[PDB]
Design a binder for this molecule. Structure first.
Ligand SMILES: Nc1nc2c(ncn2[C@@H]2O[C@H](COP(=O)(O)OP(=O)(O)O)[C@@H](O)[C@H]2O)c(=O)[nH]1
Length: 163
């Protein structure tokens, strides 16, 4: 179980194993792109800057995201990166603008990496499309909104912890 990188996201496997299969994905801007889709339940230690976390996912779905309280810029980006990495259906739907999977030279670009670059710049569109749910009643767990503040409603699957 090695530490590996997905752009600004650092991961370290806790449990589970994923199997990748190329699938045609209809993303939000109406275009269809072939993307390697991971199948299986996986759990990771995740990090973005000073923000630590635990990510749980299945095939094209973020099951849960446990993050610590830290720098709000790092909390936000970690959530963004984990949403993209999870390959959640809501994340693909959040792509409203144009994404190029080829540069101007005609070279091949990584679809997943391009999605990261896109949503790091378009977080509001992602959060709105992602949806919200009731924050946990538990005292040791709090919800978090689009402004990275403690709220009665939280981003779906995302809870902040300060234990
Ligand atoms: N769920 C999961 N994702 C992984 C694993 N290893 C790599 N990835 C992600 O899968 C994506 C690989 O996409 P890419 O680099 O374009 O390779 P490609 O699918 O062959 O085009 C990257 O975003 C990685 O972060 C893994 O073990 N489990």
């Amino acid at each position: 179980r090695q530490r590996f990188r997905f752009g600004r996201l650092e991961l370290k496997r806790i449990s589970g194993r994923g199997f990748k299969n190329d699938e045609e994905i209809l993303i939000g801007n109406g275009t269809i792109q072939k993307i390697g889709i991971w199948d299986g339940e996986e759990e990771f230690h995740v990090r973005c800057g000073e923000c630590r976390g635990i990510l749980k996912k299945s095939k094209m779905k973020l099951e849960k995201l446990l993050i610590n309280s830290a720098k709000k810029e790092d909390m936000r980006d970690l959530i963004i990166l984990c949403m993209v990495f999870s390959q959640d259906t809501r994340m693909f739907q959040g792509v409203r603008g144009e994404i190029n999977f080829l540069n101007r030279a005609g070279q091949l670009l990584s679809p997943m990496y391009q999605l990261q670059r896109y949503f790091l710049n378009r977080s509001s569109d992602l959060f709105d499309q992602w949806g919200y749910e009731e924050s946990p009643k538990a005292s040791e767990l709090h919800g978090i909104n689009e402004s990275m503040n403690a709220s009665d409603y939280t981003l779906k699957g995302v809870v902040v912890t300060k234990n």
